[PDB]
Amino acid sequence: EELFTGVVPILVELDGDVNGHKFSVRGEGEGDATNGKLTLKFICTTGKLPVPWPTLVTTLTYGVQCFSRYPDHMKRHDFFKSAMPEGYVQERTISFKDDGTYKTRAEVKFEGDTLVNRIELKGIDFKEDGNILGHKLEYNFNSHNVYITADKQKNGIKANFKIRHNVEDGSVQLADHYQQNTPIGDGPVLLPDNHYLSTQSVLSKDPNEKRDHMVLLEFVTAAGI
Amino acid sequence: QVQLVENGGGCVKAGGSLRLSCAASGSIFSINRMTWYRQAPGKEREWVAAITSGGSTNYADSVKGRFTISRDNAENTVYLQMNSLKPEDTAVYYCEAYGTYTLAPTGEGEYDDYWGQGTQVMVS
Amino acid sequence: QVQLVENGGACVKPGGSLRLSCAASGFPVNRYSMRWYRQAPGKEREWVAGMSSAGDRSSYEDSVKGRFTISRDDARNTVYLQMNSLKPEDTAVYYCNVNVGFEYWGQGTQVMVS
Amino acid sequence: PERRVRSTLKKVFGFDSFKTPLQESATMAVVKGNKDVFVCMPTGAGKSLCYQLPALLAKGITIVVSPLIALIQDQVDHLLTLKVRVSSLNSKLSAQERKELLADLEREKPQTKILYITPEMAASSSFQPTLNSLVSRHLLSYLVVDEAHCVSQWGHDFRPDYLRLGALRSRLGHAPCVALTATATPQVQEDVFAALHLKKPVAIFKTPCFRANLFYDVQFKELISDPYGNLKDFCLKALGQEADKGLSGCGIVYCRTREACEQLAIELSCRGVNAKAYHAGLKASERTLVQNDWMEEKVPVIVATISDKANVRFVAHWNIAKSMAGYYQESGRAGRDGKPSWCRLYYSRNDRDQVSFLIRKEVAKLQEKRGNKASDKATIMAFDALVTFCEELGCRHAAIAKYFGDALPACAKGCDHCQNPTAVRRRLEALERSS
Ligand SMILES: [Zn+2]
């Protein structure tokens, strides 16, 4: 907790393989855990991300939920910040409906005084003429609720949540996300009771950069306890 | 845990009457009070009626005459009867079920409160 | 800044027709796409209808496919959605979703066949 | 996990294993600390461990609040004889000692892991800057309100300082809270939960009051032609048990009036079962001799007016108690061993009216005092519940659980209603006809 007091720099690195298409994205920015603010920029190395940006919004930012403005009466239930100095491993499968599946594994830790993430992604049995492979997803990203429940056997937290993506035509694409968060450190981890984190995000594009800007300003608040 | 279930939501024209049922499941030793909350779209949730262990009834001035609250402790089921209904009262309803004291033969129990899923209503 | 108002929700017997009207503030309706979400009491929200930004292409869900209609009007700055024939599976609140940025949930209109 | 708690039990306290699985569950829940806990166990059941073991296993100080200073001193001695690092910040300490204690508190990672502070001292301006330091440093881990029942007005004891301990609980919000009570009531439980500002989810660990070894049943002296004969027969049956084994153990018969107490004792002696009055008015020497001879195998049964043996074959209440809690406590010693034991109640309309008049006079005196009115209300409510239980139709264990707030019991055997529901129906019909 005392490490998050104030403003904390954040760096994220992901290397995904969508049906052979290998892409890498390295983003950076700032986060304020006290106010639950997260302002990041994820400029992918590839000129064009093989998949839409909203699809990887949940892989590049929701892998860092320790910045959520956990209420003081739920600060104990902040699993992420607990055992954070040692880091934690987040393995998540996203089943898109009729568009295939994402398999992702990320490691969240500190380097110096900066939060860092090592993420790896893979795409399986995709549909080329689907909403995602067709790039029909709208740039804007909706607000979503992420439900979290502690499992004692793995002394971790399993997370469930459905993500909705807006489409240019008008359809809403629903994806179901199964996630597991396991502690890397052997110290006492604060296993939380069931709670849902509300996440409200905005995507924008800066004028200057030729490469994809992927400006993301998000605010996360814990709730349900 | 306690799973509160709503029932009885029905479409009634102005002046029609309908009953909203709210049933608590699981093992409950007692409920402190059950309060209904009319939450209209684009508005703030408004308390409707309150029933407390022993039968004390509280009503809001808006719904003082038209609505009535009853409860059966044998089934732990609270009912709200709605008569001479007006077009103003078109909003979803919920149950607070405050002070739900559950217990087990071993003795382990819980005191948290549980909220109902919700029921619909309309007026012509 | 941006607010949404939904009206026209009413009770309808099967085979009737109902139109829900969603008026918008703080942004032009043509430049931005619109959607309608359906939420039953105590169940998960489900999308039903949607208009693209240009308004040339519209999409519907499979359950009400061909039985729902959606349209837009710029002079009045308001979108409309027509139920056409009603079935007891339409008993859910109808929220109007459009965000220029962020997420903006409309108050919605509560409709049910009964 | 379980290994750490077991190691702590075997090293610090010495117990090989938890006394009861409920105690284990309560201790684990407090160790986790996710939700505020409320423990309700009888004296000697190990409730003090529920808040002590997590403190030994917790990080930082835990503040324990107790009503009396003598109780704090006793707890401090009990923790010191176990070589545990316990401290007490009380005005009774000397200037040098208190200065050293405050200096240790100010230092990071304070040596003390459990601090017993009276609520007044914590609320006193002297300790306010220390509490501010604690909140700033997040030193406190658990807030233990021992004897929390004092907060409830309906409880026998009222402590005005716990109402301010609740405000203190509002502050230091991060730390969880554990409220301990000896005997709890649903009204008292709700009062404790509301007054201490505990989180709405509350882990309630309450021992089941019903005893599967024990058999409950109520009789009415008006219906029985010869109540003394029935009393003698029941006492002989319970004590005798199997003929070959012979008489074993010793029974207890509770008396209300001293004259009635000695009358019952002498009548039992004449019938064939010797007994000792053990009257309060009896001089100390004779009282000690009778208590001894009852503890010794020589005397079959004893009569008691105010108040233990490892095995008690039966427990008969000649007159109804003042409150159902008192009756339950008195009957708890019935068959404290694993061998079957039975209890009896000789409820009578005249005796019930007489004790109700006594309770009314006591409540009138309390009202004349003009203080602790809620205590009088709770006492009269408890007496009403006890008389209803005497007149109640159904499982006796179930009614006791309903009163105490215990979960309904699975009294497959050892319940009067279960064995012969028709007999109970007939008995109550006969009582109604008589009245
Ligand atoms: Zn029974």
For residues A188 and D374, give the distance between their C-alpha atoms in angstroms, rounded to a whole number: 45
Distance from CA of C50 to the nearest CA of A (A): 4
- Assigned domain for A159 exists: yes
For residues D307 and D329, give the distance between their C-alpha atoms in angstroms, rounded to a whole number: 10
Q: For chain D, what are the domain ranges?
A: 2-206, 214-434
User: Could you tell me the two tokens for C54?
Assistant: 């240009």
- Count A/D contacts: CB-CB distance under 8 Å: 18
- Assigned domain for A2 exists: no
**Phi-psi map region of D402: left, alpha, beta (phi>0 left; psi -120 to 50 alpha):** alpha
Mutate to test the interface with C, among B20, B92, B122, B123 (most CBs of C within 10 A): B122
Residues 6+ apart with CB under 8 A from D77: none
Please give the C-alpha separations between residue C65 and each of C53, C111, D275, D299, D425, in angstroms, as whole numbers. Answer: 21, 18, 90, 91, 66
Let me know how long chain B is.
124
Q: For chain C, what are the domain ranges?
A: 3-103
Kindly give the distance from the C-alpha atom of residue D417 to the centroid of ligand 1, in angstroms, as a whole number: 5
Superfamily of domain B3-123: Immunoglobulins (2.60.40.10)
For residues A58 and A175, give the distance between their C-alpha atoms in angstroms, rounded to a whole number: 11
User: Could you tell me the two tokens for D29?
Assistant: 């829940």
Contact D116, D66 (CB under 8 A): yes
Please give the C-alpha separations between residue A12 and each of A28, A111, A116, A134, D176, in angstroms, as whole numbers. Answer: 6, 12, 6, 26, 35
CB contact under 8 A, C101 and A171: no
For residues A24 and C74, give the distance between their C-alpha atoms in angstroms, rounded to a whole number: 43
Does D50 count as an annotated binding residue?
A: no
User: Could you tell me the two tokens for A165?
Assistant: 């993506």
Resolution (A): 3.2
Among candidate residues C48, C3, D176, D330, the one with its CA nearest the CA of residue B42:
C3
Question: Which amino acid belongs to residue B44?
Answer: E
The hierarchical CATH code for the domain D214-434 is: 3.40.50.300
Buried b (16+ CB within 10 A) or exposed e, D152-174: bbbbbebbebbeebbebbeebbe
> How was this structure obtained?
cryo-EM
Domain span at residue A196 reads: 8-223
For residue D176, the SS3 value is coil
CB contact under 8 A, B105 and D208: yes
Kindly give the distance from the C-alpha atom of residue A114 to the centroid of ligand 1, in angstroms, as a whole number: 65
Q: Is the Cα dihedral D17, D18, D24, D30 positive or negative? A: negative
Residues 6+ apart with CB under 8 A from D1: none
Superfamily of domain C3-103: Immunoglobulins (2.60.40.10)
Q: At what angle do helices D21-32 and D47-57 cross, to 10 degrees?
A: 40
CB contact under 8 A, A77 and D34: yes
In degrees and rounded to multiples of 5, residue D187 shows phi and psi of -65, -45
- Assigned domain for A3 exists: no
Contact A64, A38 (CB under 8 A): yes
Question: Which amino acid belongs to residue C75?
Answer: A
CB contact under 8 A, C107 and B41: yes
CB contact under 8 A, C42 and B118: yes
Q: Does B112 touch chain D (CB under 8 A)?
A: yes
User: Could you tell me the two tokens for D180?
Assistant: 């301990």
Contact D294, D250 (CB under 8 A): yes
For residues A111 and C50, give the distance between their C-alpha atoms in angstroms, rounded to a whole number: 45
Contact D52, D115 (CB under 8 A): no
For residues C61 and C47, give the distance between their C-alpha atoms in angstroms, rounded to a whole number: 7
- Assigned domain for A72 exists: yes
Domain tally, chain A = 1
Buried b (16+ CB within 10 A) or exposed e, A122-147: ebeebeeeebbbeebbbebbbbbebe
Residues of D in contact with B113 (CB under 8 A): 200
Instruction: Name all chains with 3 or more CB-CB pairs below 8 Å to chain A.
Output: C, D
The residues with which A178 forms a beta bridge, in sequence order, are A93, A160
User: Could you tell me the two tokens for A27?
Assistant: 């983003």
CB contact under 8 A, A72 and D173: yes
Q: Is the Cα dihedral A221, A225, B2, B8 positive or negative? A: negative
Write down the residue that tokens 């009070």 correspond to.
Answer: B33
Give the DSSP letter string of D235-264.
HHHHHH-STTT---S-EEEE-SSHHHHHHH
Pick the CATH number of D2-206 from 3.40.50.300, 3.40.50.720, 3.10.180.10, 3.30.2270.10: 3.40.50.300
Residues 6+ apart with CB under 8 A from D76: D86, D88, D116
For the CA atoms of chain D, what is the radius of gyration? 25
Instruction: End-to-end CA distance of chain D: give it in Å, rounded.
Output: 60
Whichever domain contains A55, its CATH number is: 2.40.155.10
Strands C109-111 and C92-97: antiparallel
Residues of B in contact with D410 (CB under 8 A): 105
Residues 6+ apart with CB under 8 A from A191: A79, A150, A152, A155, A157, D32, D34
User: Cβ atoms within 10 A of the Cβ of C109, count?
Assistant: 23
Question: Which amino acid belongs to residue B48?
Answer: V
User: Could you tell me the two tokens for C76?
Assistant: 């009045």
Closest by Cβ to B107, choosing from D190, D200, D205 = D205
User: Could you tell me the two tokens for A129?
Assistant: 């003429």
